[PDB]
Write a protein that binds this ligand. Structure first.
Ligand code: FAD
Ligand code: X8L
Length: 474
């Protein structure tokens, strides 16, 4: 079994690959893996953009353990085997009239890999998915199967539920659900100025708010979602795509089939590191979005999904933007600086730069860790696309993205106290940078020392961790 992430930027062929169908079977696997000092890193769907779960030596998947065990019809709660995919849990929950509190744009993630990185959606009053776990069962190399909750070692619970697969193998999760609801989704464009005006009130008046920023333009695409009490409040598809189709014809039945995202991919392909060419692609996409204002209605699960496009490099940071009651302007200032920089340094940055918001997490490891609840994090995701399979063109884009991320890395993350998403962080080779990174992790995470202490307490032989984990927590 050879195993590759979504963007095929990372792949691994583990010497050992285990896929147990029962806790009993997994209990054994770790017991024996412990007894022998053999690596077994937990893996979910393997989709993490940075290969977090990848180990040459050994990996365990709970893909076959994916049943919904119990529904508490009253406390609005599902207990689910860790191997269940988000999609699988949305389907099972449907007839029980329940849904998850939030979704992370794709739904192929396993609950394990979903919670272990503190995945998030958007919505200023909605935490990342760590704060959605009531209880978990975790299989430890040292203590065996232990039950965690706000009651059973709540100190460990919060450190475990977001443990980057390093504190044990999660077998069960009880999740705080909300009632299955339809959602009204509003898409519109705006200027920086128009954003700044309605921003503070927009976050607070709208359940979900996401901004797609389009570099080398003053077009920001805003997407609000709110529950439909009772329903929905024009350009043709051909007319929406005309600018991108017209731009590609400059440099057909080949074209007429391509989706909006295939056109971007096919446009970027032409010359993805020439900044002037990207200027033109981004302007055309801005026009598309200008021709795509409107409303949709659907179930939260259908609406909070987002088509992310082709294979890609991405980097998302979570940084503090005050509290509900004391608004901050870090979030829009962050964006101003970043768009000042891309122009100043001639970065061939395609669209979109995705800015979202979450409530704080009580999970020490969450990149939106706050002691104060009703705190607010802005998340900002940068992207370069890999439109083709030319390893040549794919290594220039890899270069340029590292430089793009590196420039944010210095100029912004320190200033704003920005912590990287656990699924997107890349361990740099240059030993300067790795020590540079390490001092930043300490700087942004108080619970670090306590996290390696739980690693020795629960996995003293270190069979659950890979190079990545060792390099980040030395
Ligand atoms: C196209 C795309 C869009 C995305 N959008 C979002 C988004 O909107 N929001 C967001 O927050 N993230 C997003 N992500 C990132 C994604 O949520 C994470 O990569 C997620 O962790 C993937 O889940 P997985 O099951 O594939 O995890 P894997 O990559 O398989 O594993 C993730 C982590 O969990 C551990 N693990 C997995 N299963 C278990 C288990 N049973 N017990 C213990 N540890 C376990 C692994 O060791 C690893 O540390 C996106 C990724 C892609 C590719
Ligand atoms: O990993 C991710 O990929 C998407 C991004 O590519 C948006 O274009 C999600 O928003 C998330 O940040």
């Amino acid at each position: 079994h050879t195993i590759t992430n979504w963007s095929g930027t990372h792949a691994v062929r583990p010497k050992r690959f285990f896929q147990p169908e029962s806790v009993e079977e997994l209990e054994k696997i770790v017991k024996e893996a412990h007894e022998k000092g053999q690596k077994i890193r937990p893996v979910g769907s393997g989709l993490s953009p940075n290969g977090l779960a990848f180990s040459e030596d050994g990996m365990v998947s709970l893909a076959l353990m994916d049943k919904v065990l119990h529904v508490d019809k009253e406390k609005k709660q599902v207990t689910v085997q860790a191997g269940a995919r988000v999609q699988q849990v949305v389907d099972a929950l449907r007839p029980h009239g329940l849904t998850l509190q939030n979704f992370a744009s794709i739904s192929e993630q396993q609950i394990g890999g979903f919670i272990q990185v503190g995945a998030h959606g958007t919505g200023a009053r909605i935490p990342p998915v760590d704060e959605q776990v009531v209880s978990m069962k975790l299989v430890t190399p040292a203590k065996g199967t232990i039950e965690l909750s706000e009651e059973k070692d709540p100190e460990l619970f919060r450190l475990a539920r977001c443990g980057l697969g390093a504190l044990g193998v999660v077998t069960e999760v009880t999740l705080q659900c909300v009632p299955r609801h339809k959602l009204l989704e509003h898409t519109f464009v705006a200027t920086m100025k128009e954003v700044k005006k309605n921003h503070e009130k927009l976050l607070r008046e709208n359940k979900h708010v996401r901004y797609m920023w389009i570099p080398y333009t003053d077009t920001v695409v805003v997407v609000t979602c709110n529950p439909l009490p009772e329903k929905a409040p024009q350009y043709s598809e051909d007319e929406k795509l005309q600018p991108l189709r017209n731009l590609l014809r400059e440099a057909s039945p080949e074209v007429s089939g391509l989706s909006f995202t295939e056109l971007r991919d096919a446009l970027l392909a032409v010359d993805p590191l020439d900044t002037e060419w990207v200027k033109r692609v981004n302007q055309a996409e801005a026009e598309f979005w200008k021709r795509s204002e409107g409303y949709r209605v659907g179930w939260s699960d259908e609406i909070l999904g987002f088509d992310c496009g082709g294979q890609q490099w991405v980097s998302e940071v979570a940084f503090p933007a005050g509290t509900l009651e004391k608004p901050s302007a870090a979030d829009l200032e962050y964006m101003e600086e970043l768009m000042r920089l891309i122009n100043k340094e001639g970065i061939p940055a395609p669209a979109p730069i995705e800015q979202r918001w979450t409530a704080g997490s009580s999970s020490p490891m969450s990149p939106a860790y706050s002691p104060s609840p009703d705190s607010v994090f802005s998340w900002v995701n940068i992207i370069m696309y890999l439109p083709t399979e030319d390893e040549e063109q794919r290594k220039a884009i890899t270069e340029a993205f590292r430089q793009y991320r590196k420039l944010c890395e210095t100029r912004l993350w320190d200033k704003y106290g920005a912590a990287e998403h656990w699924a997107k962080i890349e361990v740099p080779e240059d030993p300067e940078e790795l020590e540079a990174l390490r001092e930043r992790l300490r700087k942004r995470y108080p619970g670090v020392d306590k996290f390696n202490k739980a690693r020795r307490e629960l996995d003293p032989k270190n069979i659950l961790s890979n190079d990545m984990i060792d390099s980040l927590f030395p």
